[PDB]
């Protein structure tokens, strides 16, 4: 079991903390949803290979440009998150996060992840966004952004229902194992 390091980046409202919690517990919390995530080492077997994947969150570091890069040393795979209920979080992907992650993590694979995919067909979400002349991010808009930033791949998930969550972390492990 080789050790690999994963870091999740993205805006404060992208759902990165929730995603790490749901994966690490293999359950959406039924009693209390934690505010923060410390770290975790997941045992994962992907395509016949056993890996210990250390998980780290960047939540709370978004406003601190000198503290935030301390999370990046020796990272093996980056999960770059945006929320499907927020086209504004997707616009900040090529603007701020991509040049930062390419600077501190050169040649590290980046997986662009569309979170909260359950909200794409949510009526309250569609009504709220229409007031600011917006709509939920379409899957093709996510793919095009991923292609544009040179991401290893594009994936979507919902921490609420767990759909796609296992797949995201298994693919992150595969990317971490590549040359």
């Amino acid at each position: 079991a080789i050790r690999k390091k994963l870091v999740i980046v993205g805006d404060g409202a992208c759902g990165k903390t929730c995603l790490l919690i749901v994966f690490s517990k293999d359950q959406f919390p039924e009693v209390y949803v934690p505010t923060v995530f410390e770290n975790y080492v997941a045992d994962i077997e992907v395509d016949g290979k056993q890996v210990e994947l250390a998980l780290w969150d960047t939540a709370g570091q978004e406003d601190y440009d000198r503290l935030r890069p301390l999370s990046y040393p020796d990272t093996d795979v980056i999960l770059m998150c945006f929320s499907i209920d927020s086209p504004d979080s997707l616009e900040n992907i090529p603007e701020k996060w991509t040049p930062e992650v390419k600077h501190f993590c050169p040649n590290v694979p980046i997986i662009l992840v569309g979170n909260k995919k359950d909200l794409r067909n949510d009526e309250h979400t569609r009504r709220e966004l229409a007031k600011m002349k917006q709509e939920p991010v379409k899957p093709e808009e996510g793919r095009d952004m991923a292609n544009r930033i040179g991401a290893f791949g594009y994936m979507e998930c919902s921490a609420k229902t767990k759909d796609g969550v296992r797949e995201v972390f298994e693919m992150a492990t595969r990317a971490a194992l590549q040359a």
Binding site: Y32, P34, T35, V36, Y64, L67, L70, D74
Partner: protein, 245 residues
């Protein structure tokens, strides 16, 4: 951590830690406030435990078993005793507030109504100056500590055996040397998230809402000061590289 505190913070939430007959006596908004205060204290207990692994397991084990060159153990674990002193004091104050709030005849049923004042005290005056000085120093030495660790693990046989030996137990899975250093660096940026969510459920008493609003502002001032005082030290970097930054 000591068994008494581990057991008091074993449950996933305050609502599962207290007796179900005690939980039924409170309003929904009080349960939400108490679950977030419990997460703050539980994560502080874990953070103090991380600092004890660094001082007692790693640092002390290297001094008593290995023959490292002078200044190597300090370089691997910068400011660990000052950090341990800051957070053990803060944890003691948090656990004393919980202890005083316990119902007579119970070691688990409590409600903390006055957290704001404790947070204002921790994040102002001499203790905020010490946190700012200690984290500005620690975070500026983060890169140097990681590089020093990597060199020793790859070139010193006895150091590699030591690390593999003390990190072998399952309870150390998340707590290798580099993992402890990043857990500590990330701790300070967790405080605003926890405080803001406690504030969200503390509108019932206006003085408490005001105190948590002041505490949140003080924590953000501390973080801004620490962030502005960081510059990664690099062993071997020449003066020309520094004054041309």
């Amino acid at each position: 951590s000591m068994e008494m505190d581990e057991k008091d913070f074993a449950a996933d939430s305050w609502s599962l830690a207290v007796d179900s007959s005690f939980l039924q006596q409170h309003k929904k908004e009080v349960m939400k406030q108490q679950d977030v205060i419990y997460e703050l204290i539980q994560t502080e207990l874990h953070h103090v435990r991380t600092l004890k692994i660094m001082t007692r397991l790693f640092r002390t084990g290297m001094l008593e078993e290995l023959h490292l060159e002078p200044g190597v153990v300090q370089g691997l674990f910068p400011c660990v005793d000052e950090l341990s002193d800051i957070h053990t004091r803060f944890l003691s104050q948090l656990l004393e507030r919980r202890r005083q709030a316990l119902c007579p005849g119970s070691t688990r049923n409590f409600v903390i109504h006055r957290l704001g004042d404790l947070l204002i005290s921790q994040f102002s005056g001499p203790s905020a100056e010490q946190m700012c000085k200690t984290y500005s120093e620690f975070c500026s030495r983060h890169s140097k500590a990681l590089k020093l660790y990597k060199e020793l693990y790859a070139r010193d046989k006895r150091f590699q055996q030591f690390i593999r030996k003390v990190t072998r137990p399952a309870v150390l899975k998340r707590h290798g040397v580099q993992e402890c250093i990043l857990l500590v660096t990330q701790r300070i940026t967790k405080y605003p998230l926890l405080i803001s969510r406690i504030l969200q459920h503390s509108h019932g008493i206006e003085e408490e809402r005001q105190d948590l609003t002041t505490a949140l502002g003080l924590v953000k001032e501390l973080l801004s000061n620490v962030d502005e005082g960081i510059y990664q030290l690099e062993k071997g970097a020449r003066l020309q590289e520094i004054y041309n930054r």
